[model samples]
Target chain A: MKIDVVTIFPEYLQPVRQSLPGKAIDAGLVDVAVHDLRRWTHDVHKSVDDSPYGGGPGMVMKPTVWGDALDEICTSETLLVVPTPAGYPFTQETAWQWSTEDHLVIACGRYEGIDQRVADDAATRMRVREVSIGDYVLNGGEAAALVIIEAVLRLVPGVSLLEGPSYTRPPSWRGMDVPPVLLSGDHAKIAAWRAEQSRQRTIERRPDLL
Target chain B: SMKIDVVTIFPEYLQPVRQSLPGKAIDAGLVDVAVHDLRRWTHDVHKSVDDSPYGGGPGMVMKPTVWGDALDEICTSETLLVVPTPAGYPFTQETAWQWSTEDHLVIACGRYEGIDQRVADDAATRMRVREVSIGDYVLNGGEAAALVIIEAVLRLVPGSLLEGPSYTRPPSWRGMDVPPVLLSGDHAKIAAWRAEQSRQRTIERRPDLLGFDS
Candidate 1:
């Protein structure tokens, strides 16, 4: 799979080159590129945002700059993922779908957000998914872009595994001991205990998971 | 106005924190941000941070002592210690707003399966502790979630403000037009149009935000 991220803060997306995603790139399973959104700007300030048509407190990214950027970077087969607080929630299932795509283009919006028409117009040609990493708001879509990329890249086949609670060799720590069952040397009992711990954790902290 | 210390196994993964919004706040003196290596607290020669799960799980769990020592040295009575985990409470804009009021935050980033449960359990006796999950999806570690949480909370600080759907110049782009009301030159009408568009957009993309689950 190929992943291209366009952002004004390309520095913020740097971690995609360090962690699991980085390792994935090194393994030849995927290709990743981070683009500077300002590259498409034609003005002296190289400005990407301006006053919203309707009066607002913040600047809105220009549709022309984004329109040109997306037009050059995206092909018909590309899946354009726009990160925004107002977009639909990004879930595990969403990551699953992105992992299967051959190409993904993530447009990271700053200021108020990219002009609404950017995604609307891009959708007319290629797949467009406007997604939110969570319910919170951030300085820009750059952080969320890193998040969505991590989630999707990890889902790629043979990429990784997310396991249950873990405790190490310390039989005891600060007067706390490893749960006795964990040291029982009984595989069946150990497996059952881990499973129950996992279940209880979900119930206690995230009942919605049920 | 605040101090933030993020402890992570991969300290380099946090470089973005020093360059993004939080970085600017650091420069402006509104906040102080520090990223620490989890290995810094390790007492062993090999600096091992994780081991096999107690009950034979599929992956390793972060050791308690390493995290315990880090938090002990970093946290104060007023500190709000945040740990990012999939099992934790959902992080939201409200959570960010609440955290913005705090004077100090120490975010513990966990890898592998997760941090030893006792790390948060022990710290709860002295300071505020919140285990927040950015979303339902999983990632390589809590580093990304920590970035998400930090950026979200810092944006709510005194200096930075927040968003709404917006349109800029180029009324027409590739045959698509900005909502006509935005360009209508009627303030009240434009405001009403934006309010309705926001309401409609929320319902269409995120009905859950509207108090309904579809």
Candidate 2:
């Protein structure tokens, strides 16, 4: 898989390149690229925000820089993911779907948000999907984009460096310790236990997942 | 439509903030959102955002300088400065709806026992300030509580969503998915079912919504 992220704060994306997703990149299962959005800005000030077209409290991110950056980086086959608090909720299922794609282009917006025209135009040129990592707000989409990368990268084939190719454990399993059935060497029992655990966790913490 | 700016040291922990429904709403133009790197405002090379409390506390409190700069940069006259602490008003759907109408929101993610009261005081003078909590338990930081608020408030915005009305309806009630009356296909029944579900969920998870009269 190939993933490209466009953001003003390239440094905020360092964690993606240094952590788990970085390992996936090194293993050759994925290629991750981070680009500074300012490169596309023509102004000497490299401005990315402007007063909202409608009356508003804070500045809204300008469309020109975002549009140019996305246009330059995105391809016909690229899947565009925009991180925001107001987009559709991100889920494990969404992560799994994105992992199967050959390439993904993520646009990280700051301030009030990127101009609506950018998303409207990007949708015409690529498969644009607005995704939110959670129900909260962040200073920018850089961290959110990293979360998407981490979630999707882990789902890619051959990304894990663990020995014995398919020998991988789910995220919840790592925190609570693997079930006894998983170590008992019984395939059917392990499957049943895993399913039961998934249901239980979803029910207790996120019934909406069910 | 209010914009909430979160200032924290471990911004990575906030990664989950963009994966949920509220994050989607913001991306879709339902709400205004931004994040500030408190470290960016720090004068020191180490980029520290915290310091020991003046009275000698067990855990470190976020320095007044870091929060002061963050609030000044983010807050506007319409901003509500919210600090999520153990001692605060319990968060509810009503409050979430109230906040949705504001032009801006500034969320201060407190660490340790709390931040210096001075920071809250400074923010209070410029904007409406409230200390709120999601539940009784403690969290490592205020990110989780802020997530709850974002989700609750964004869904209430008029044009902030698409898809199922389940976004507005409360969670399952009486061990079922929406009330059967909603399936009656009568608009009145559906509206009634929604009201009942909201009432039931509020009663079960947040009796405080009823002023604890129940």
Candidate 3:
């Protein structure tokens, strides 16, 4: 997968560059570029904000600056993911769909948010969707982008799946021990234990996924 | 204002905290954020923060003592603990809203295999402990998820937005028009439009939010 992030805070997207996704990039499984949204600003302050049109407490993100940037970067194949509190929930199933796409453009909205027109313009050149990671409201969409990128890369075809939760040896420490099933030396029993563990953990922690 | 700290094996992992919204909140005096290296509290030559899991497995579990000591050093009696893990409860906007008013927040970033469940149990005796997962999917570490929580919660603070959203000067562009209501300039109409869109969008895209389970 190829990913591009256009944000004023380019520095915030470092996890993708320094961690596991970095490994994917190094192995040529993914390509990524982080562009500064301010680069497209035409003003002297390099300002990218403005007061809302009607009446509101916060400023809305300007449209033209984003227009200039997306106009230059979006392509016919790009899958544009815009993060917003008002967007639909982003899910594991969505990540699976993105992995097969050739290009991904993440537009991070800070302040109030980017104008609606920017998203409209993006739709003309790329497949665009506004997504939310969960019910939470982020300070900006960069963290969501980083999360989505890491999750999507893991689902890309031919790439290996991540290891499930694991345990290792003290036999008994603080009243915790590896399940007897894992040490039983019976493959069938071990597989049953593993499946049961996965089901048990998911139900306990994430019944929503069920 | 809130006081926040994160304990993690990967200290550099907190780099995003300084470069994103939390950092801005710090600069604006809305919050104070700090990241601690768990290894710094380890009493060993190798500075190890993890050990192979007891029963036997593929990865390392963050040692209870390393985390215990780090928390011992950083947390006050009034702290709220947020541990990001796949083994934790789901995180939601409601959760963020509930947490925004906390006086202090301490995030524990578990890595490798897992953390001794005892670590959270022990902390619960002293403070409110919220074992939160950013989403259903897992990640290599909790630093990124921790940042997500911090950014979300702090932005809910008054004056933390720094700048804000809606529409502007260009009426239309690139073959699509801005919402006619946004450009219409009738305050009463725009406000009504806002409420209806929220309702309609929720119905079309997230009916679950309406308690329909669709």
Candidate 4:
């Protein structure tokens, strides 16, 4: 699969080129590139943002700049993902869906967000998925893109099951010992113990998952 | 209220935190951030931070000692230690707002199965410890979620304050035009249009935001 990211803070996407995602790229399982949004700007300042039309607290990304970059990079098969706080929540389900796509172009929006028309217009040409990584807001979408990349690419190769409690050496530490069941060579009991622990932990911490 | 320290095996993964708004805030003396390599606390030659889970799992479990020592050195009585896990409660704007008022934050980025569960359980005795999940999905580890949490909290700090659909100059391009109301010079009409658009967007794209069934 091919992945392209456009952002003013291209450096923010550096993590994508280095970790497990990087390993996938090295193996030729995927293609990833980061482009500076400024490359498409036309002004002497090379500006990509301006005050919002309706008056707002922060600047909004310019349409022309984004339009130029998206036009050059996107094809009909491209899944253009715009990370925003207002978009539909991105879940493991969404990540699983995106992993099967042949191409993805994630546009990292800063300030208020990319001009709304950018996505509205791009929808005419390709699939534009406006998604939010979570409920909280970040400085921009670059970090969100990094999150999405890791989530999606990990699935592309293969990947579940929420992990249960884990322990390492020093069975006894500050009054706590490794769960006796774990140390027992009885594999049947150990697996059952882990399964129950995971369920109990989930019930205590994330009943919503039920 | 703006000091942060992150402990992770992949110290490089947190590099983005130093490049954007958090970096700018650090430069302006409004925030202080330190990213520490988890291996620095390891005593073994390999500098390993993980080992086989005692119960036998598909993945390694981060050693409790490595994380315990790291947390002991970094956390104070006032520090809020945040560990990201899929099992934890969802992180939201309310959580970010709460964390921003904290004097210090020490985020332990876990990988593999996870850092020993005892690590957070023990640390809670000395400092406030909260495990948070960024969303229902999982990533390689907590590093990405740490970046998400740090940005969310730092932005809510006193230094950074601020959302909506937006447009900019040369309104018409390649047959796509800015909404007519945005082009109109009337301020009242523009505000009303923006408000309605925001509401409509919330309804169409995220009815969950409206607290009503679609």
Superposition error at A34 for model 3 (Å): 1.4
lDDT of 1 at B79: 90
DockQ for model 2 equals 0.02
Instruction: Supply the global lDDT for candidate 3.
Output: 0.76
Output candidate 3 Cα RMSD: 4.1
Question: Ranking under lDDT, best-scoring first?
Answer: 4, 1, 3, 2
lDDT of 2 by residue, B142-180 (tens): 765665566566767777121112311222322324334
Residue ranges of candidate 1 with Cα displaced over 4 Å: A20-27, A158-165, A185-200, B160-165
Model 1: lDDT of residue A110: 79
Evaluated on chain B only, candidate 1 has a TM-score of 0.92
Mind giving the per-residue lDDT tens digits that candidate 4 earns over B100-149? 88889999999836888889889988888998889878687889899889
The residue-by-residue lDDT of candidate 3 on A1-210, one tens digit each, is 778899999887765665644456667787878999999999999978777666677667888899888888888888889988777678777887888888889999873688877887677667899887877777678888888877787676444122234544444445656566657778776766667767877777666667
Q: What DockQ does model 1 achieve?
A: 0.65
Task: Estimate the TM-score for candidate 4.
Answer: 0.93
Error of model 4, residue A202, in angstroms: 3.0
Candidate 4 chain B minimal-lDDT segment of 10 residues: B160-169
- Model 2, TM vs. native: 0.45
Q: Write the per-residue lDDT of candidate 4 for residues A57-157, one digit (tens) a residue.
A: 77888888898999999999999999998888799899999999999999998747888888998999899998988778787888889889989988887
Go through the candidates in order and give the clash count of each: 0, 26, 13, 0
